[PDB]
Symmetry: D4
Subunit: 180 residues, 8 copies
């Protein structure tokens, strides 16, 4: 292949995040060397999930995203069978021990209103909290409850905009924008 | 021997916890390669003790479990001769500098009501606080005082249920359940 | 060259700070081996910026100083396009996520009143917060808002005075004082 | 020499503490291999000073003990010339940025009342705060202001009593007790 | 699944070897949790390849096995376009810079005579050197040229027999033997 | 800028080599973000120099390339004033303690015959040994004395061809080829 | 207990050697805190075995001493079933891949002639090579074949005499001498 | 003090060498901050001793210089009581296990002929081998036996001349030259 986006993803993101994104796509039958926009999206969504759990108190969140599917589910059963929360239909991203709810994290390239709508439709179980992030710098969360501090959310939006600038500086943003 | 449970314990728990459990059983004349259910129980009880001390503030707890008996006692004398607390008859697991009491941690495979009863009977000295944990996800603590935050206790129950799932997934839970 | 001040700067400051100061001066066409007083000033200003961000909460500050100009700007655009703050004319040193403002850090060898005046004149955009530090041990901040705790600011002034003592002990302070 | 106390000190205390105590005694013309009770006392006093600064908030204390005399003084001048505190006649152990005072730490083998008296007599400058610790488990601080939390002070007394037990277990406590 | 062989493979082999074997099987559409005998065979073949390159001089061998297919081929082209050796039809395991030939490593569960025959049939290009190893402790190499020292080959056979003993001790060898 | 070649250089070469190449170009007034082909050439020439010194015995070579000019010269004077070798007019790359001569390493994109000619013309002092390497896989050394083993030189040519394949796979080789 | 010899053993020998000796004695029902002379002898014999394998070429020796009995035997079976050597009746210390024989290492406090005699009597199988070392500085090996270089054996005797001096300097050698 | 030479010594030599030289001078009642030329000479002599032992085979040399006097002697007794070599009157620097002799290393600022003469006069025991090194680049060894390879000795002279250049570049060589 030899795509500019693949080499940018490896230079932009942390090696442990690239490896986890590579393992995730291959597990679902995706090629990071061919479909490089999904490779960039998976790394971005992964890093956002990690910074999110880094916000707030220690051991406040349980990280579901990034684990292989079987083990990622195994933790979901344990959290449900411990706290008494309904089992989600689809795999979520985190669990909040402080608010006792799962969190589905989204990173969109359009307006946050559309992405949340498509997310809340698939998640017919209204118990899982939703928190969308946008590259331009918006965010929409369920019941206007954004969970973390303003400063922790601000760090995420700042990094999101840096990625967009880095892509556009290499003339790869427009392909990534029209990808979603 | 070559038991499935021994290889699972080594793959499931952290190497430092396995070594401490191995040293503990051998010191009391127990074979981790033969009696593998007690090997799994000692690792589980050890990890629960470590997460427990990881809850709350730093240097809030003094870890007694995991040390060799002579040194584990030596610290008990120092804590007693410093705070003026009665010397426990049997070796406890932790000491709470915030609540000024020793803690005996239990991890049971039956209902928490029975295990606490047997624990409180041996500990005729009602000064040592008792905190039981169950694999299914319950907990019973003395005077309904559970010491740590709800989130820290929730992390322990979640990990406890993951261990049960991992055992049952390998068809070793029933032997571990009827072991106690 | 073989200047006493160059070898003192390398012995006084942390290697990562010396490398960042070396990279900064060379990027702006400055020689650390020739103009060693500016070499000492850049290291001092860098270390003060790092301790400043180390004060307060984690992820409270975004460190702009120390990055290469293109990337240092890139983060400024992201912070502006995320929080809605006006773009500064000149490169600042940090950004406060808690107070939503950029910070320009100064380390002067004269009275803090003059240095602040020259700083506020160049920064015609009154939105960027200014915080001056002096070697003797004073500080002047915009609107008397010194941002960090008294203890964190005290640590900075103490280190500043240690550097002056170390220079004067080697008979290099007077050259550094009349340098500015 | 080949003293039991020297090998106990090396086995009991952390290597960085032993090296700092060795460097301290040699600087003052003392032999750790000959006068092993002073070797044990210097290590104990050093470790108590380190745990003390580990109590409370980060960067709350400035550690004076453990540095070589010239640099230990250099920091004292900087703290005085920054906060406006009188220069102590004798070298103190720490400085409290929160309470704006120097701390002299003592570890005695008799009752804390005597040791404090001898300490307050030498320190005719009543500005430096005094905090005595005893092996048996007492403490006396100036104006009954013990600075740190009860839990942090309790950790120090517990460790102090463990050292006494370790010495007595090797029949070296009586020599250490009649040493002071 | 929860197979005894999967947990044995993770406990028996080095983590970097397990990860490389996991990545290899998934790339070829194989499940290490389901087909655990091939999981053990891939780890064994990988470790044998690594010890083989560890024999002899440094930089004597170029390791082809363990790399992802595209990069593993890329190195083959470079070695061919540098030394002038014919391009192998199938991916080999190593390249010998000292003897200027590729090496195909085999680890069989039957007699080495059969495995070599099947290997030499697929490798119709007689230029690639073949070196078979057996669990019981035999070896067959092309033209009786075993490349490495007797001591380095002996270390490989010893480790091979230890793996067989470890499997048989857990009653998993017969399934692994009848697997091939 | 945002060039594909810059991100490839950072992904292809080791971080310490990229930093040394960056420092080298900036010192000579070159921009690695603009003139990315020279950025790739400097990294390649650096890595070839490092592998070259890695060949043969330990401490056989003194690495001149990679150091800043003033210190790189300083070592040249020491080697000359120690062994009695004439001072080279231009900065060489290594020094051979075994053959008592400096080595100038070249990595060309045309035939090795031309590059050596231009190299030997500038180096009018015929004492400095010359060793050219080509991407396609040739090498020309002074007096047919190639210094290192055949296997060590083969490793260099193999890596050289891998870089060419990686560039061509990303459609950046032709620009790099017509660069020289 | 609190013995001078126990604290000397911990200060004299490497932590990994002390842990292996502790695990060895406990496995055979021995107390390192009570029988401290056997604790010193096991550490000494262990360190001698490790330096012995460090002599000569890499991977020349297979270390049997230091492993737990079951695994130490497992390797013996593999070495026998690979090289065709008779199975030793008692556990040896090393295996020589170069000379194809097991080695029994001895460290005596009397003359090497007696210790070898008692060793060769128990080892009725004359195939296992014997190599005795003495604290004073002698050595006796089977068939006058001392296996390693003179320099490697000299390093062992030098360290052996340093241990004797360290013990005698603490007035513990005579108890260790009359122990055997 | 604040001497240019002290800060140069700390910047020129490795931290472990500076610490060992500091400990050596203080042990003999010397101040590295006052007598900085002896501080530079001790570091230089130490580094030369370390490179010397780094020459040749592994474990060929026993390093005596750098240890504290009591332990440095202890090893000398062990080497003598093991190999049967006469005890040196003064402390040597190394011991050669290959040539069975102690080595006294010298680093002079005058001609090597004088320094060797003064060295051989004090060492009336003609058994200890002598090897002098000069800053300008000469060497004189007993019986013209220079022990190590030409390349290893050349590395030492090259580093020696680099130190002289670094001193002269800072106008501190003349003081160091007239120091001896
Ligand atoms: C726990 C471990 C990996 C974690 C992944 C995640 C990464 C974390 C690393 C931290 C440290 N920082 C921050 C600064 C640089 C760095 O390095 N962050 C957060 C920000 C970006 C990043 O990288 N975290 C969080 C806990 C500790 C840790 O490392 N993951 C992976 C998915 C599940 C999980 O918990 N696990 C768990 C088992 C397998 C494995 O590998
Ligand atoms: C102190 C030391 C060992 C401690 C054991 C315990 C382990 C701790 C490790 C932490 C870090 N985490 C967390 C993430 C992974 C990791 O690694 N946790 C807690 C969770 C599971 C775990 O593993 N703790 C607690 C203090 C620091 C430390 O390490 N122990 C052993 C018994 C007594 C004791 O205090 N000691 C003390 C002397 C001997 C020794 O070894
Ligand atoms: C993040 C990383 C480097 C950081 C520089 C800065 C240094 C920090 C180091 C800390 C740890 N301490 C404190 C004790 C000793 C030590 O080591 N401190 C603070 C005090 C002095 C010091 O040294 N910080 C802050 C975050 C973590 C870190 O390391 N920088 C450089 C400019 C931008 C930036 O964030 N980055 C970012 C990308 C390139 C790079 O290198
Ligand atoms: C700063 C550095 C050394 C510090 C000494 C002190 C030691 C500290 C180590 C911590 C980490 N813990 C705790 C767990 C094990 C461990 O390791 N603790 C505290 C408890 C016992 C201990 O050991 N601290 C405190 C700051 C970080 C650090 O390391 N010192 C020495 C005197 C001055 C000083 O600040 N410095 C400063 C310059 C020279 C040097 O070496
Ligand atoms: C180079 C690197 C990984 C290597 C894999 C291989 C592993 C090697 C590790 C050595 C060290 N030992 C030995 C003792 C324990 C240990 O750790 N051994 C050999 C014995 C078992 C083992 O584990 N080697 C060999 C060179 C250095 C290295 O690590 N590989 C993977 C396939 C290609 C390759 O060269 N690479 C290369 C790029 C990706 C990556 O990861
Ligand atoms: C010495 C040090 C840096 C060296 C650079 C060079 C790098 C070497 C690293 C080795 C280890 N390998 C090999 C496997 C991965 C790795 O990491 N190799 C060789 C192959 C590629 C590579 O990276 N070498 C050689 C000696 C040890 C060392 O590291 N340099 C830089 C120029 C001068 C010099 O000697 N120095 C010296 C002072 C400043 C500095 O940084
Ligand atoms: C392999 C590993 C442990 C080894 C023990 C042995 C220790 C070795 C350490 C070396 C490095 N040096 C030398 C300088 C300081 C140091 O650290 N030396 C030799 C001299 C003293 C010493 O300490 N060796 C030898 C191979 C690498 C290694 O570490 N052992 C323990 C018994 C079996 C074995 O092979 N293993 C194997 C599985 C369990 C484990 O732990
Ligand atoms: C053994 C240990 C310290 C040694 C000192 C000496 C230092 C050695 C370090 C090597 C690695 N290199 C080389 C590259 C950078 C580096 O780091 N070199 C040699 C060149 C300069 C240098 O620094 N050596 C030699 C053996 C391993 C070691 O480290 N010493 C101190 C005196 C006695 C002794 O043997 N010891 C022993 C007990 C106390 C202690 O600390
Ligand atoms: C698939 C699943 C994965 C593992 C990630 N698992 C997810 O559930 C997940 N994956 C996404 C991504 C970034 C993938 N695609 C994306 O842009 O969002 C749409 C989506 C949502 C859920 C599954 C697949 C795609 N984003 C989420 O927010 C998200 O929760 C990897 C590749 N394909
Ligand atoms: C014995 C003691 C040990 C050291 C652990 N010391 C304990 O006191 C302890 N050990 C347990 C375990 C898990 C062992 N067995 C168990 O399941 O609990 C029953 C028990 C309680 C106390 C001693 C022995 C068993 N559990 C506790 O809660 C506990 O406090 C190891 C092996 N045999
Ligand atoms: C230039 C810019 C740099 C990078 C640093 N960037 C800065 O903006 C900056 N640089 C300074 C320094 C210490 C440099 N000189 C100084 O003493 O202050 C005057 C100053 C201010 C801004 C730019 C240049 C000099 N100090 C600041 O406070 C400061 O914010 C390096 C060399 N020359
Ligand atoms: C001297 C000074 C040192 C450096 C330590 N500096 C001190 O000031 C200091 N040293 C002590 C010690 C434990 C030494 N002796 C002791 O037991 O206390 C009496 C004392 C007090 C001050 C100086 C010397 C001794 N204890 C303190 O509390 C203390 O503050 C080392 C050796 N001799
Ligand atoms: C200049 C010097 C440097 C430092 C490198 N110093 C060199 O002497 C050097 N630099 C080269 C490079 C790869 C640069 N250019 C190149 O392709 O070779 C031509 C060359 C030779 C010498 C100086 C400059 C260019 N190659 C050599 O072989 C070589 O020895 C960096 C940038 N510009
Ligand atoms: C037992 C076995 C061990 C494990 C060590 N295994 C040995 O085989 C062994 N153990 C020795 C020691 C030093 C123990 N005792 C000793 O001094 O030698 C006599 C001896 C020999 C064999 C077994 C036990 C003692 N020495 C050897 O040379 C030796 O090979 C530990 C404790 N008791
Ligand atoms: Mn997800
Ligand atoms: Mn998501
Ligand atoms: Mn317990
Ligand atoms: Mn318990
Ligand atoms: Mn700035
Ligand atoms: Mn500034
Ligand atoms: Mn003090
Ligand atoms: Mn004190
Ligand atoms: Mn193969
Ligand atoms: Mn060059
Ligand atoms: Mn070159
Ligand atoms: Mn043995
Ligand atoms: Mn033995
Ligand atoms: Mn000397």
């Amino acid at each position: 292949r030899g795509s500019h986006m693949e080499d940018f993803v490896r230079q932009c993101f942390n090696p442990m995040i690239v490896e986890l994104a590579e393992k995730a796509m291959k597990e679902y039958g995706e090629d990071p060397k061919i479909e490089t926009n999904k490779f960039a999206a998976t790394c971005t969504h992964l890093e956002v999930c990690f910074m999110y759990s880094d916000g707030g108190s220690k051991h406040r969140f349980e990280i579901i995203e990034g684990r292989d599917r079987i083990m990622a589910w195994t933790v979901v059963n344990s959290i449900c069978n411990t706290t008494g929360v309904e089992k989600p239909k689809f795999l979520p991203d985190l669990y909040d021990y402080k608010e006792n709810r799962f969190i589905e994290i989204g990173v969109t390239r359009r307006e946050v209103h559309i992405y949340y709508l498509e997310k809340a439709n698939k998640i017919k179980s209204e118990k899982t909290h939703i928190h969308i992030f946008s590259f331009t710098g918006e965010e929409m969360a369920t019941k206007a409850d954004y969970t973390l501090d303003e400063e922790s959310r601000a760090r995420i939006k700042t990094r999101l905009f840096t990625i967009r600038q880095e892509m556009a500086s290499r003339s790869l943003w427009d392909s990534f924008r029209q990808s979603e």
